[PDB]
Amino acid sequence: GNVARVVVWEWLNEHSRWRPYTATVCHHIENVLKEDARGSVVLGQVDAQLVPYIIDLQSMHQFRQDTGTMRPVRRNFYDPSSAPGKGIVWEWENDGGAWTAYDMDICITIQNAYEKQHPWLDLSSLGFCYLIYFNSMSQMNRQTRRRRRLRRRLDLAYPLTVGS
Ligand SMILES: Nc1ncnc2c1ncn2[C@@H]1O[C@H](COP(=O)(O)OP(=O)(O)O)[C@@H](O)[C@H]1O
């Protein structure tokens, strides 16, 4: 009953980047974890688009049914004052019109810049040649100058638990 933190389940992708599940999915994973620490989260029950994937809480891996391949997952934690504590989410648009949430650490940084009335934010130190402009609400590649739309939604807060 001492410290409060935000649960963010993340999965490791081909670019060695920890990608976050949505808040809807993270609440579902936690609900399964509370019941049995050796359980298996059928992501298809909460998200029909994640129907091939299974989260094996024993080995802490994302399991593919049809192929058998695995990707490491993790139950990561962030400050309750950050964006996942409330459900603030920053997403960018690809060529096809689909919106994709930033990495959780970058997403929090964007929200920190925004609320401080920072005109823009530079992710070069973070390992991203990208520049985010809040006035135009757009992202720009520092090297290629290519731009993409930016948006911020109020989705669902990520699960919040207590550290003793
Ligand atoms: N939990 C997830 N949520 C959304 N997309 C995912 C997830 N896990 C994997 N992907 C996407 O699936 C693609 C790779 O397919 P994957 O299911 O990992 O099998 P394999 O790596 O054997 O091709 C990656 O580009 C990744 O972006």
* Cα–Cα distance for residue pair 57/32, rounded to 1 Å: 9
3-state secondary structure 61-90: EEEECCCCCEEEEEEEEECCCCHHHCCEEE
Q: Tell me how the structure was determined.
A: X-ray
- Of 61, 79, 97, the residue that ends a domain is 79
CB 77 within 8 A of CB 3: no
Helices (H), the chain: 23-35, 104-115
Domain identity same for 102 and 148:
yes
CB-ligand 1 contact for 149 (6 Å cutoff): no
The residue type found at 128 is F
Residue 43 CA, closest ligand 1 atom number: 1
Q: Please, are residues 8 and 26 in contact by the beta-carbon 8 Å criterion?
A: yes
Q: Which residues pair with 151 in a beta bridge?
A: 91
Which residues, including other chains, have CB under 8 Å from residue 88's CB and lie 6 or more apart?
A: 107, 111, 152, 153, 154, 155
Structural domain boundaries, residue 109: 83-161
What was the resolution (in A) of this experimentally determined structure?
2.4
Question: Do 89 and 150 belong together in one domain?
Answer: yes
Alpha-helix residue ranges (DSSP H) falling in 2-103 = 23-35
Do 90 and 112 have their domain in common? yes
How many alpha carbons fall within 13 Å on the CB side of residue 154?
Answer: 1
Query: Closest Cα partner for 56 from 69, 46, 47, 48?
Result: 69
Q: How many domains does the chain have?
A: 2
CA nearest 55: which of 43, 67, 66? 43
Ligand 1 centroid vs 116 CA: distance in angstroms?
35
Rounded to the nearest 5 percent, the helix, strand and coil shares of the chain are 20, 40, 40
In a shared domain, residues 57 and 120: no
